[PDB]
Amino acid sequence: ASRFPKFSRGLSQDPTTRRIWFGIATAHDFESHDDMTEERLYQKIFASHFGQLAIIFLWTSGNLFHVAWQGNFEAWGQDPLHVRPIAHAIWDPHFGQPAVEAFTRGGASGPVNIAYSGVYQWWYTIGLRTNQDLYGGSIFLLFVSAL
Amino acid sequence: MTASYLPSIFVPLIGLVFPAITMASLFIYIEQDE
């Protein structure tokens, strides 16, 4: 409990490099830890579940915000057959001029990626028609993740 | 893109500086005997 893995003594007293590795591996096996009881385990499961939900909602809010900020959702709404949905913009300092000219397709002003996740059709079906709605959803999802 | 100056501010601050500091912090936390 005085070294990197504080939940196990066998890895703490390990002088080799293996102490690092098996510290990251057996990091979520709360059952086989030191001084574990059936009431600390369950509460750790509860808190980890809450953290997982927070991460999921943060991911969804990020998707919403990045489609609202850099995407072309409004344009796609009025022509969903002759336009490509933009996922986000790219800023790679290693790019060359032909790469910038190649990846600048769609309607964007710079180089961007094309969303192959189908979120455009989903959001358009359930009744979202403006970047303002996407931003509202994004801030609301930030709020619920904070909660 | 409204700002268009933020991607030049953040990815240098998230692909270069963020790992550079978190790896140092985690290396100090790993290689210590307390």
Binding site: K44, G51, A54, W69 | -
Partner: peptide
Amino acid sequence: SISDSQIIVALVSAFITGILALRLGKSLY
């Protein structure tokens, strides 16, 4: 987020959420 202030609102809200996650992680350890 076609506006300008809205990006700042998103940034500060993300920072608050980050502080909350920090406190939760400290409590989990």
